[PDB]
Amino acid sequence: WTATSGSCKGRCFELQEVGPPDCRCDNLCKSYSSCCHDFDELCLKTARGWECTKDRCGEVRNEENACHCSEDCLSRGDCCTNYQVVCKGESHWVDDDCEEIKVPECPAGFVRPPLIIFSVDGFRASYMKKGSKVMPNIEKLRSCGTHAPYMRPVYPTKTFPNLYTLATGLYPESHGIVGNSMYDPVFDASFHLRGREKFNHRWWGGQPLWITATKQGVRAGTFFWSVSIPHERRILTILQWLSLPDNERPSVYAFYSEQPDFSGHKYGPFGPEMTNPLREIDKTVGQLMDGLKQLRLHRCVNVIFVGDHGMEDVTCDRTEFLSNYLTNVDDITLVPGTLGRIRAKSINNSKYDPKTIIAALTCKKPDQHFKPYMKQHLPKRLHYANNRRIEDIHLLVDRRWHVARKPLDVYKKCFFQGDHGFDNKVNSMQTVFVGYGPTFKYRTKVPPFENIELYNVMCDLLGLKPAPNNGTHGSLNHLLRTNTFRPTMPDEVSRPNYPGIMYLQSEFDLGCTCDDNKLEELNKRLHTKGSTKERHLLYGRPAVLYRTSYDILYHTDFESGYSEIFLMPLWTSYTISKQAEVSSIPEHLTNCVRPDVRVSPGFSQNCLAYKNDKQMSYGFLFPPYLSSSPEAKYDAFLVTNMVPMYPAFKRVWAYFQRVLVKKYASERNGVNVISGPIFDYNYDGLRDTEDEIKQYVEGSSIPVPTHYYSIITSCLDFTQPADKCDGPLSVSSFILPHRPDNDESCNSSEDESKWVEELMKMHTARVRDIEHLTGLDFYRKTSRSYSEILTLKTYLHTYESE
Ligand SMILES: *[C@@H]1O[C@H](CO)[C@@H](O[C@@H]2O[C@H](CO)[C@@H](O[C@@H]3O[C@H](CO[C@H]4O[C@H](CO)[C@@H](O)[C@H](O[C@H]5O[C@H](CO)[C@@H](O)[C@H](O)[C@@H]5O[C@H]5O[C@H](CO)[C@@H](O)[C@H](O)[C@@H]5O)[C@@H]4O)[C@@H](O)[C@H](O[C@H]4O[C@H](CO)[C@@H](O)[C@H](O)[C@@H]4O[C@H]4O[C@H](CO)[C@@H](O)[C@H](O)[C@@H]4O)[C@@H]3O)[C@H](O)[C@H]2NC(C)=O)[C@H](O)[C@H]1NC(C)=O
Ligand SMILES: CC[C@@H](C)O/C(=C\c1ccc(Cl)cc1Cl)c1cccnc1
Ligand SMILES: [Ca+2]
Ligand SMILES: [Cl-]
Ligand SMILES: [K+]
Ligand code: NA
Ligand SMILES: [Zn+2]
């Protein structure tokens, strides 16, 4: 109950919100239906519209007007945004040449430049180019400030997951808003865009920017705006707050636009009806900038223009229906549309089986426009599994499509021509970033980056210490003129051992067999001491950032850090020049595994366990195919280079090692490769400890990886060989799931040249993703600045065209 009979006089858009049943005047009261009786009259004035005109100049103050054109308005902070233009012969901000803002030019009493975040729902990245003629204010911000060609949203590319990622720096799985619609089985409650439950604080995890600011003594304007408050009024409220006294005035402000998303749903991303909403957004930007210039704040404030996600063409006819696949369709609940999430309709049905649901939805129709997954098999780059609100069964829907349960759902609920929510690597889902102000750089283009990184930068802009988040703090230092954050490299926790020859052949009883001069003996000794290490370990050895027991092992062709705990390398490092040759495994060596005389029998794998384990075979981390000489090839068959692999996965691995590495070496002028295992049995994105491992090679203590990674580095200037690079680096990486079948790839019964590369592309990764998953830290010794290396570690190779 609200006693809606208090008053909003002098209280309009109160920054601090009051407790029921005393009535509310905040920009969220409308949404609770708790506004005082006089809110509309006092706070939502509209008389005479939104602009001064010639005859209104120097008028008698009429407090009923929406904005003012009287003399006292500037001191009062409530002029129409075009007042000085109309009544003082000033120019519009958009008509002024741009001029570098070297230092904040702020009124007395400002302690720090204010930050204004202007976010736009559904503003697709290509609108910056394709709408440029109808957005002159936005184009000036873009060309004069710092801009990326696009910004990558998080998955799913829905509104609330992305806006809440902007505010917190967290993946949806950590902040808890995992879709626009959700069921939490612990609360036994649902979350919907329409309605009540979404306001409850228990949905919203992490610490958003406005809370981070308040806790550290920085005042914040409110971030939520009720849909019914018009845009002009939102701008005027912000401008008013900026005229408050020093001790009351916020330092951070947010504006939100429902456009162009709302129109894009009705008309498609490039419908001819889309020109008008883009014009209207630009006009709003113009009003903010004219208003700032009037207050002498246009060279004082940092402005961020940022989207949540793009928009794709999607129509009713492009719907797959689960009833064309499932007999049992009424025993399931589907979360539908541009992604799919499936659970049992009733927890009292013990006959429900996720396994047979998956099997019934896998590769059934020749052009099937969705692919089912257990959530823990989704590409790791999506970070979409570690939340009880995310259902075990997930459908990744092809761009331009929808999934629904039954046809009745689509026609009893064609309306729409646009939608979003797809995989966050998809071009049409990309969005925008522009930063403008004294703390951003002048006329600077930066490469594409992910929206998880912005929270850190907004903290930097405000002098705040960020709450723990998924950004990599310092990786966006290159956007900023000043306020950079100068991180230090994490300290190595475990130092390696460097074992020599300590064991005789006959001490090993592993069930392994292998059919196997003074000049060339000093030679082999030195290779084992680390003579070619500078060639194969280009960027230093990775640091181990947790407590463990491991050894560095040197070889002619490769170097590895071998784990005595997991009985296999944590990492294997080798360089393949443009010139290198592929050989085959000789016949006499096909099943050869050799004891490593540097490593105890007790810290070794064994061949018998693989013979006994009918499901599990093995592969090698440094590929035998790429050995430098017949004699160096023996090193590749050491038991310390062996790892467990399902026969289905060996098909993948073998093609990557036999064909693709040489291909990248020829295309890139040499590559450096680091490969290794990953164990993530609890799908949290973080390295497992030994007590978390759920599977072992039968009869042994050999743990089974959930994934295999590789990091492939070369010279960004590809006229320099990878091993002789003077400047910036170029990287691509992957995290391949270690699966006992190839069900994920519908064409896998064909030749590896038709499906393996496509699989690897799907499972593209950031080096940073691999660091979380292994507890390692790469690129420790380069000649590049650390911030530049952090940017490189957050890079994602997406394999989309331009
Ligand atoms: C992205 O960045 C984020 C942020 O840095 C990373 O997430 C963090 O990871 C840490 C490790 O997983 C984790 O640390 C744990 O914190 C526990 C205390 O948790 C509360 O406090 C924080 C801080 O105020 C708060 O934010 C948490 O909020 C979560 O929970 C509520 C819902 O319950 C949500 O509203 C909120 O969104 C958030 O949910 C997310 O996180 C949890 C995990 O905490 C997930 O389960 C959810 O699905 C969701 O994703 C909490 O309210 C603390 O209890 C933990 O300590 C246990 O484990 C350690 C190991 O060191 C052990 O020493 C301790 O004894 C303890 O074990 C005991 O409990 C066990 C389990 O009950 C039991 O088995 C044992 O027997 C022991 O007795 C742990 O320190 C931190 O909480 C999150 N933070 C956030 C905000 O998510 C994330 O890793 C990054 N991602 C990547 C890929 O890098
Ligand atoms: C769910 C989060 C909510 C706060 O997101 C909104 C805006 C937003 C989020 C983050 C940032 Cl950095 C800036 C802005 Cl403007 C919003 C949503 C719906 C109505 N009004 C405002
Ligand atoms: Ca884990
Ligand atoms: Cl959703
Ligand atoms: K076997
Ligand atoms: Na298949
Ligand atoms: Zn939308």
PDB file of N, CA and C in Angstrom, residues 100-106 113 299-300 437-439 481:
ATOM      1  N   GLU A 100      40.750  19.650 -29.650  1.00  0.00           N
ATOM      2  CA  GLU A 100      41.292  18.733 -28.645  1.00  0.00           C
ATOM      3  C   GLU A 100      40.983  19.194 -27.241  1.00  0.00           C
ATOM      4  N   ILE A 101      40.553  18.272 -26.381  1.00  0.00           N
ATOM      5  CA  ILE A 101      40.299  18.599 -24.984  1.00  0.00           C
ATOM      6  C   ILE A 101      41.492  18.004 -24.211  1.00  0.00           C
ATOM      7  N   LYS A 102      42.564  18.782 -24.076  1.00  0.00           N
ATOM      8  CA  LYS A 102      43.773  18.330 -23.373  1.00  0.00           C
ATOM      9  C   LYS A 102      43.607  18.171 -21.875  1.00  0.00           C
ATOM     10  N   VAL A 103      42.748  18.982 -21.249  1.00  0.00           N
ATOM     11  CA  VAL A 103      42.579  18.999 -19.782  1.00  0.00           C
ATOM     12  C   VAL A 103      41.080  19.260 -19.512  1.00  0.00           C
ATOM     13  N   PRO A 104      40.539  18.768 -18.377  1.00  0.00           N
ATOM     14  CA  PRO A 104      39.155  19.112 -18.059  1.00  0.00           C
ATOM     15  C   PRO A 104      39.012  20.624 -17.887  1.00  0.00           C
ATOM     16  N   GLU A 105      38.030  21.214 -18.564  1.00  0.00           N
ATOM     17  CA  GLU A 105      37.721  22.658 -18.428  1.00  0.00           C
ATOM     18  C   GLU A 105      36.385  22.764 -17.716  1.00  0.00           C
ATOM     19  N   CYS A 106      36.467  22.763 -16.390  1.00  0.00           N
ATOM     20  CA  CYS A 106      35.314  22.617 -15.506  1.00  0.00           C
ATOM     21  C   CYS A 106      35.058  23.897 -14.667  1.00  0.00           C
ATOM     22  N   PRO A 113      35.999  15.300 -13.347  1.00  0.00           N
ATOM     23  CA  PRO A 113      35.039  15.426 -14.465  1.00  0.00           C
ATOM     24  C   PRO A 113      33.857  14.453 -14.289  1.00  0.00           C
ATOM     25  N   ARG A 299      33.308  20.744 -22.303  1.00  0.00           N
ATOM     26  CA  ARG A 299      34.740  20.359 -22.306  1.00  0.00           C
ATOM     27  C   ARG A 299      35.176  19.893 -20.914  1.00  0.00           C
ATOM     28  N   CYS A 300      34.204  19.419 -20.132  1.00  0.00           N
ATOM     29  CA  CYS A 300      34.432  19.015 -18.761  1.00  0.00           C
ATOM     30  C   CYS A 300      33.987  17.582 -18.518  1.00  0.00           C
ATOM     31  N   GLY A 437      35.656  13.180 -24.370  1.00  0.00           N
ATOM     32  CA  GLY A 437      35.884  14.005 -23.197  1.00  0.00           C
ATOM     33  C   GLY A 437      37.368  14.136 -22.881  1.00  0.00           C
ATOM     34  N   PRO A 438      37.695  14.862 -21.791  1.00  0.00           N
ATOM     35  CA  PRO A 438      39.101  15.164 -21.418  1.00  0.00           C
ATOM     36  C   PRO A 438      39.917  13.917 -21.092  1.00  0.00           C
ATOM     37  N   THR A 439      39.286  12.844 -20.599  1.00  0.00           N
ATOM     38  CA  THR A 439      40.027  11.640 -20.196  1.00  0.00           C
ATOM     39  C   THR A 439      40.181  10.657 -21.362  1.00  0.00           C
ATOM     40  N   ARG A 481      43.575   9.125 -22.341  1.00  0.00           N
ATOM     41  CA  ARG A 481      44.612  10.143 -22.271  1.00  0.00           C
ATOM     42  C   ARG A 481      45.344  10.034 -20.945  1.00  0.00           C
TER      43      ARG A 481
END
